[PDB]
């Protein structure tokens, strides 16, 4: 029944058969006779589901476990909104545990927060923090800017040349010429002032602007090189050497994202009253000031850290990301965050908490929140897609939940390092 | 229907009956007002997938669109390996889609190499990569260090108290009685050199060691707690402020990891000819490098990085750390990298490539690689679980393989940028 | 006699010998608080307050090599020193002909560490066979940076956003405008940690550095954002976010005082026999070093050989804060192949914080006004405001870019 | 020869592409030659070089010399530090700064003074080397661990000098490269000079195990001198050094016009939390450079060494039984600094070095001068913080 390769080709070729009247071992059979390369199953194959069979099938006979994908899951998926979107070479999905932390009492309302992570009490840990929060009144938050940004390296063939180009930028007028090129590439795309610096004959320039309520890496990157375009007719001898120079900066750490900020920059506070602090926390406010100071303060600052004065920050920014399709390898710069702890009330026992986050890299539309069961998470906090009457109010309100849950999960971890055990 | 809550509690504290008895509407009705809370739904309902759909009901109610879990997956997923381990107040799980990039050619081996993402072309960006490594001869590493560490922060009444207590360490005989304390805790546990730095009477202590093929965090701050309830036997006046004081440096970027490493320390390189890199990835050596030194070196150094002296090795660990379950959070101190391209060879036309690697906090034990989808990734790779006949083995593998990873996934950016899009 | 020496002080101190003046303040008749007025000349204030500081040293001979004769104390007291016992002699040597921007500069260099001088001296030589150096000032504004607290984060976000809004800025501008004549406020940039606002005021200053300038104009634009905002409370008028005299990024990005580029092409021939190296060593090992070692070192801004050598000999010549070195020394150092072949070296140095002025501080004193005069940059600028400083400016990074070029040469040499 | 001519004759040899007997005669000439080349000639005249000792400094301390620079020198005095006093002489040109630092050793001395430990000791040469690939530079790495290793590379640092004793050594990869931190004491000098020698002998014995390996650069700038740097403030170079006060609420008061809780909120607000705002690495302060950069050049010092010889952290505590006096420490591991060579081997640099009593070596116990006076910088920095902090907590 397995037909020779030949009879099996025609078959492929033949219009109104194709793939679908071969067997899977027959397919298999022409891509290791070089037939059909590996990269070309994707276009060739009918269902989504059994181009992933294939490549699995194709995929186990060259480990050293022939058994080893046994586990990990394929079926029954969408890969309807992955392929040619999301993901590449795709042999199955990986399950991420989803647990709910709050209510998250913010800004007078209530959030249930979804959480993916694998790390045992993380979420019963913030969920602690959620009810410290809750029954000290609840928390208050501000979105200070927004803006995401790309800073791509061009060179001139002299400093000198350089500095033309800077001074040229920082006019009125050439400003304005820059602005109306990178706006016209998409109704969000509204450009801030222009900064940037200079390392003898290169220039790096940091384009900034709203996104919607996208995180917005391809639209400012779509009208940073129709901008940087424009600046190369006034500027001949200009080259782009690269559409992103490590300036905006994005996906490592940079003190340019703490000081400028990226995305948006959210402050979020509270003020637990000294009875929640001992009901809920198991500690006072003194010992909790006294661990902030000297670890999220003092000990950050003796191992050399810029933007890392928190405890975990990065665990409630990891968590979220993942479980609302957020690109989590942007939780480098995300977690950014200052956590402070002072003294209230007459006799210093109540504690205002509160934590700064510049850079927050988020967003409601496009990448993995494209996806089902990440919008079934965006569903949960009432931010999923597109504010049609309130363009970035999704993202921004997403952003100002990832700060408040973030102090949620301060408070908690910062009370059980004071308490001992 | 639903019976009153005083015959129902005497159902569940019927041993021969139990929760089995009740119905989805009154183990409802008893959470709703008290007599359960919600997390002792774990351990009382008769199985663990029920306890999640319970959950999800209460869950439901409190949402202002109550269909918002709809498309959130949940059923058939094995929780066993998950409650009480990885996740609290579980409602699903989050799909991640998995693609694989290969093969890796590294130290004469093949890999193939699963990647847990959302950002469309990340999976065949690494796979081109890939492609320009194999066809180059292949990339090799080396493992320069191999420790997990811990920093706590202590206190003396005085810095001159804080000052002996730093002098004691430094002794022999000293570190010897810590290094017992510390090394009797668990049979992994080999105490290095300690690092410590004072504040005034604040006294922090970097206690490192290897950790079997676990990540090792809870190993090392079961070791430290021993070894300061020690040093504390000879200094009975220092006080412990946390056992964590932000010297670790765990999830939060700092110049310690980038300057004395934390869990492993990874190099690895790679000539790529230059016929493959004008043929794969469409440039030429002459412009990556030019490209790496004005972007990954002199972009990074303008924007204030310290340690993110690269394009986008973020992106291949959050990648690899997803599906292989290691802690996604890690990804902040894990993705320090340092990328360097050079001339190489006779005619000085082919790419020399570096990526170095720090501080990949990276274990194939515990946590979340204690699930069996994430395990079936890891048996890919072949260093899924502890290796008996050489401790440490697999997670040293795992790391050589990122850190290759990592330099392919940069070899095909940075040529996509050098060719202008 | 005790009580015929204070008779003599009621007419003057002048009429009274040492000894006298020296026995009223041991036998305890005067306090030695009061000497600093009663005594009328200077030279002898100096004198007396060595002979009552000696007698307290374990070697009361410590101050015989200490010089303080025949020096002008007038400018110093009350405005440049205190509890003054004397001078320190800094050896002044000069590197030069430095061929910038189509002049020529003589150099001073104020240090006592052997071959720096001769060094640098051997950088402008290879500049100047090389067609001399360009640069330019890419910007300019000193900068003070207070910490404000509010009652609430709620509050401090408000007044961030009052202070971005055209009306809130144009009105703190204004307050800020009416105390000096060189005051004009730039853009704000604004940080909130929690309740506390850290405010960076920025201004030019004419040709002064400018700190006391902004700190005037500082405080009276926070009185008028306390009436727009009464609960607002005033910690420091310094919160660390200028930042002066301390390492810190936001100097390194947003820059600080003149902000300024470098650049000069050597010949490959000059690079062989002024230099004793080739263009590719010198690149190989700049790459290495100023780039890759201070990455791996962790460096914020110190991405050069030995920037703060030359930034520090010419400060403390020409009358600037030497204790600026700090941030004033911040600077990467850019070394590339150039010409036909690939064979001359492209160098450039870009300082984005050069904290610097030729009026005001140090520069009242007339040894400091010596070498700004040689220069060609003592005093204020009347034609244009502010230039004397830029030119200054120019200079040290000149001076820089040539210290770079002979030390990364001999360390390429070996 | 050269004392029979005059002034302008000799002027004219040189000029015709053509030593004398006196050194101020020597540095007349270079004053009158560069004079032709100014645009303003008469503008030489105020700077003085007369009468000074031009001696020690030629061929030593500087060339091409026209010259010297007064800087005024103040006293900040008494400071009280480990149970001595102490008149520290502060060479600066900033109106107030001398005052100030001398209203915080007042507050010190009321307080029962300071005290202060050094808690490492070691000058530091980051040079940089290279190997073909990662791999070798890896294995130069794992045998510069190994005590074997270590050892050899010890006896040859060793070898140049009396005072080459080498501690534990540091060292970083990227790629091919390897980056190596060498820490030696070196008696009572700064050090520099001696630990580069040193490093040019164990770099050379480093070379015959490993033929292939090139010596790149004896400073690749992982020392670090003179840049700001992470590893400076992390494991230290030259003296680190710690000291500490506890203010009594009454002298907050009266002599410092302010409060205990004052003093803790902007000390927290401003050197922690500004400092963080602002992306500062080890400049956790308000003002150390003042004081460092002025004993520095009233020391003879390399007064370039402030840059990282100025970080500091300052840390502000309530303490005492009512909760109301003021605990201070100033953290600095950094100091690089010396009492014998350089700029310290010329006269009136070592009038200022022996009102301190640390002047030249430490016959009983080399090295011991040094850092005595790391100690001073420390304690000197501590009162400089206190007196502005609670000016600026004062509200000036
Ligand atoms: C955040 C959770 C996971 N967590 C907690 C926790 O919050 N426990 C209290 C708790 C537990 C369960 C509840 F239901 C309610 C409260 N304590 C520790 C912990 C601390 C020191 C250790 F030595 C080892 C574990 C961790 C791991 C922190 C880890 O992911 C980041 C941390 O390393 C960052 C840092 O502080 O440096
Ligand atoms: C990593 C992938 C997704 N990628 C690629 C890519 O690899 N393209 C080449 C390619 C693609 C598919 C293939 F099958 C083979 C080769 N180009 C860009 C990109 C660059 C500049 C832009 F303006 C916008 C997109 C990105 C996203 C960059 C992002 O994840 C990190 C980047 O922002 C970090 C940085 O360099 O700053
Ligand atoms: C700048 C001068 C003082 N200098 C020179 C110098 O330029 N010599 C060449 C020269 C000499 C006289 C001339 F007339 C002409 C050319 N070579 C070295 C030197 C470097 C590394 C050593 F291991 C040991 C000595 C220094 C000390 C640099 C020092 O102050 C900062 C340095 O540590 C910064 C760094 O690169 O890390
Ligand atoms: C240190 C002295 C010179 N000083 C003083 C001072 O100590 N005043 C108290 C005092 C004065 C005289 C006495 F006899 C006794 C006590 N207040 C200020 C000052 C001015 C404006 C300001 F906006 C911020 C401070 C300065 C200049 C600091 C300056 O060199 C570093 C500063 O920029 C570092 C910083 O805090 O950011």
Same mark, same amino acid.
């Given at each position: ?20 009247? &071969?067997?899977?071992?027959? !397919?298999?059979?022409?891509?290791? +006779? ?8 994707? %276009? ?21 476990? @022939? ?5 990990? @899951? ?6 309807? /909104? ?52 809750? /029954? ?33 930028? $920082? ?52 009208? %940073? ?5 424009? &600046?190369?007719?006034?500027?001949? $001898? ?32 509270? =003020? ?8 809920? *926390?198991?500690?006072? #406010? ?42 989590? +390898? ?8 200052? #956590? *402070? ?9 109540? &504690?205002?908490?509160?934590? %700064? ?15 089902? @069961?990440?919008?079934?998470? /965006?569903?949960? /906090? ?18 100002? !939940?990832?700060?408040?849950? =973030?102090?949620?999960? $301060? ?5 059980? &390092?004071?308490?001992?055990?």
């Amino acid at each position: 029944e397995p037909r020779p390769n030949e009879e099996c080709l025609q078959i492929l070729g033949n219009a109104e058969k194709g793939a679908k009247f &071969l067997s899977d071992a027959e !397919i298999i059979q022409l891509v290791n +006779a070089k037939h059909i390369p590996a990269y070309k199953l994707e %276009t060739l194959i009918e269902t989504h589901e059994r181009g992933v069979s294939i490549r699995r099938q194709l995929l186990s006979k060259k480990l050293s476990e @022939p058994s080893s994908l046994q586990y990990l @899951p394929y079926r029954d998926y969408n890969y309807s /909104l992955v392929m040619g979107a999301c993901c590449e070479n795709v042999i199955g999905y990986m399950p991420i545990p989803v647990g709910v932390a709050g209510p998250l009492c913010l800004d007078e309302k209530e959030f249930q927060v979804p959480m993916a992570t694998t790390e045992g009490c993380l979420v019963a840990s913030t969920n602690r923090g959620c009810r410290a929060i809750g /029954l000290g009144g609840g928390a208050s938050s501000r979105v200070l800017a927004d803006g995401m940004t790309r800073g791509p390296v061009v060179r001139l063939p002299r400093a000198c040349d350089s500095a033309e180009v800077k001074a040229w930028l $920082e006019t009125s007028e050439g400003f304005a010429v820059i602005k109306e090129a990178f706006d016209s590439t998409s109704r969000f795309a509204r450009l801030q002032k222009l900064h940037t610096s200079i390392a003898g004959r290169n220039l790096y320039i940091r384009f900034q602007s709203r996104s919607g309520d996208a995180m917005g890496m391809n639209m400012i990157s779509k009208g %940073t090189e129709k901008a940087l375009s424009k &600046l190369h007719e006034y500027f001949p $001898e200009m080259q782009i050497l690269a559409v992103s120079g490590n300036y905006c900066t994005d996906k490592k750490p940079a003190a340019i994202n703490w000081i400028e900020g990226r995305g948006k920059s959210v402050v979020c506070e509270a =003020v637990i009253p000294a009875k929640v602090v001992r009901e809920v *926390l198991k500690t006072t #406010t003194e010992a909790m000031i006294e661990v902030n100071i000297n670890k999220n303060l003092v000990g950050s600052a003796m191992a050399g850290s810029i933007g890392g004065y928190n405890a975990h920050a990065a665990n409630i920014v990891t968590a979220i990301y993942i479980a609302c399709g957020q690109d989590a +390898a942007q939780n480098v710069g995300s977690s950014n965050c200052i #956590t *402070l702890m002072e003294a209230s009330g007459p006799t210093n026992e109540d &504690l205002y908490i509160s934590c %700064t986050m510049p850079s927050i890299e988020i967003g409601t539309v496009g990448g993995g929140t494209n996806l089902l @069961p990440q919008q079934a998470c /965006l569903q949960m /906090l009432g931010v999923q897609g597109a504010c049609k009457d309130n363009p970035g109010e999704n993202a921004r309100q997403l952003a100002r !939940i990832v700060c408040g849950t =973030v102090m949620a999960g $301060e408070l908690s971890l910062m009370a059980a &390092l004071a308490a001992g055990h």
